[PDB]
């Protein structure tokens, strides 16, 4: 499974160039961008162009996993480890062995976990929670954040050494409003995938597309995709004009 980076804009053109530039190395990648800009789609496309293309792709959202569970999710645990540890199980590093681990919202990672991540980056070994046995894995790290990690380093909330280990190959995702020339293409991609997965069908006329291009997109792409899914559930196989798009998408 790999989604394509669509669009004609210079920003997306650059991102596509970078996928090829970094294809020859396992250098850690750090993808900066507002929430919803497509950072996981970039990470999957990068993985697909990497030497690891046939290895696993494993996402982790440090922002959607409670701080107390993240270490167990990342490193696994033994059955005796903590109260709820009723099985022994490999975590997401082991599941990513030979492939790519996508650490999303890295700026929500707690500082102790940041130290442990730095150790796994450097030494390429880790320990399950509740164990001292050394585990080796070969995982290529792609991390993503919407936060200013450098100010976080200044504030002492993020580690400078971890940041430099992650930021070997940086990528900046443009917000949707800086590349609205892509929206038509993105819409065709979204709808097309939506149809190929039998989740629905929609079309936009040109005025609707103009109105959408006039939008601010606080949620970037993700918000666009949620809108497609919503209108398709709302007007099955319909044609969206401007009346079907009425608050906060309504600019005419």
């Amino acid at each position: 499974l790999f989604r394509s980076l669509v669009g004609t804009s210079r920003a997306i053109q650059q991102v596509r160039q970078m996928m090829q530039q970094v294809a020859d190395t396992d250098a850690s990648v750090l993808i900066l961008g507002e929430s919803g800009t497509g950072k996981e789609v970039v990470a999957r496309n990068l993985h697909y162009h990497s030497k690891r293309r046939e290895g696993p792709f494993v996402p982790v959202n440090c922002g959607a996993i409670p701080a107390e569970l993240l270490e167990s999710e990342l490193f696994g645990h033994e059955k005796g480890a903590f109260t709820g540890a009723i099985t022994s199980r490999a975590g997401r590093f082991e599941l990513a062995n030979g492939g790519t681990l996508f650490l999303d919202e890295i700026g929500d990672m707690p500082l102790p976990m940041q130290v442990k991540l730095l150790r796994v980056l450097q030494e390429r070994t880790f320990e399950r929670v509740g164990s001292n046995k050394t585990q080796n894995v070969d995982v290529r790290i792609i991390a993503a954040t919407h936060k200013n990690l450098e100010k976080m380093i200044e504030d002492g909330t993020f580690r400078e050494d971890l940041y430099y280990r992650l930021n070997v190959f940086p990528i900046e995702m443009a917000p949707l409003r800086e590349r609205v020339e892509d929206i038509a293409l993105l819409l065709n991609e979204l709808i097309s995938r939506m149809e190929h997965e039998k989740r629905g069908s929609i079309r936009f006329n040109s005025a609707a597309i103009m109105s959408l291009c006039r939008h601010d997109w606080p949620g970037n792409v993700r918000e666009l995709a949620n809108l497609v899914e919503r209108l398709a559930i709302m007007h099955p196989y319909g044609v969206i004009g401007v009346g079907e798009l009425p608050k906060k998408f309504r600019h005419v």
Binding site: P56, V60, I65, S72, G84, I86, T87, R89, E94, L95
Partner: protein, 274 residues
């Protein structure tokens, strides 16, 4: 191989029929040829076994307390549905922590013999047990009835999941509806509220009618689908199962705690590793 569909049956409001829906949907899916697993996620107040008239030798209490493994408590129910039974008032099961819920959800990885079938019967309410199982599932099925309290509680659950977890897609099943048009109007009442205040995608699944045969079945502690195979409620459950069985399969892992994540990765060594 293929990913497992995972459906969390929820709704917030008590008594709207969550457990009757989970049980009879599981049996109807089994009737279509699916290998079905049913988790009673009302972990300290088990009702799946009660509705089915079963007396499990072991429950999840035995797992939590370290007497056996999760695999050891699977119970063969009607139609071959495999049940993970909860506990009833057991001290170890009535205040499980978030880490215990997470360890349990993780433990389900020890399972690879089901398709489109983890049906998760959630407890009443919108607390952490409910929300963690709902987020760990792939489809959220809200059971709603045509009373202001059910509409209000379903809305509050949709609003919490959207506001705090970014969830946008929700399946809606009208239960105990006194006619099909009443259930359609109910869906419209809920979407009037959600359209006004939120940006969410609600999908109407259909209706389970109000049916005396369900009340009789509950008295007998047999599933209405099995005890009254030709009642209108059982026919409606067959229809809902066909719709559910046509729902798109999960494609990719999302980055959070979810059931069977190693199979979502779609990589043989990953799927083999846990």
């Amino acid at each position: 191989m293929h990913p497992v569909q995972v459906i969390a049956v929820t709704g917030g409001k008590g008594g709207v029929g969550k457990t009757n829906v989970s049980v009879n949907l599981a049996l109807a899916l089994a009737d279509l040829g699916r290998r079905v697993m049913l988790l009673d996620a009302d972990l300290g107040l088990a009702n799946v076994d009660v509705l089915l008239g079963l007396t499990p030798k072991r429950t999840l209490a035995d797992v939590i307390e370290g007497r056996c493994e999760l695999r050891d408590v699977l119970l063969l129910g009607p139609g071959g549905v495999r049940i993970v039974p909860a506990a009833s008032g057991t001290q170890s099961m009535v205040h499980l922590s978030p880490m215990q819920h997470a360890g349990l959800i993780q433990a389900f990885s020890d399972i690879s013999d089901n398709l489109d079938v983890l049906v998760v019967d959630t407890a009443a309410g919108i607390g952490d047990s409910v929300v963690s199982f709902v987020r760990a599932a792939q489809e959220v099925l809200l059971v709603v009835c045509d009373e202001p309290t059910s509409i209000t509680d379903a809305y509050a659950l949709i609003k919490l999941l959207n506001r705090d977890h970014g969830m946008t897609r929700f399946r809606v099943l009208a239960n105990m509806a006194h006619s099909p048009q009443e259930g359609r109007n109910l869906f419209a009442k809920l979407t009037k509220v959600t359209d006004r205040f939120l940006d969410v995608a609600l999908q109407y699944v259909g209706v389970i009618p109000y049916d005396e045969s369900v009340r009789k079945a509950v008295q007998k502690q047999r599933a209405v689908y099995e005890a009254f195979p030709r009642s209108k409620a059982s026919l409606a459950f067959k229809a809902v199962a066909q719709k559910v069985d046509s729902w798109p399969l999960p494609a990719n892992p999302r980055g959070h705690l979810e059931f069977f994540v190693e199979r979502l990765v779609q990589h043989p060594a990953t799927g083999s590793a846990v």
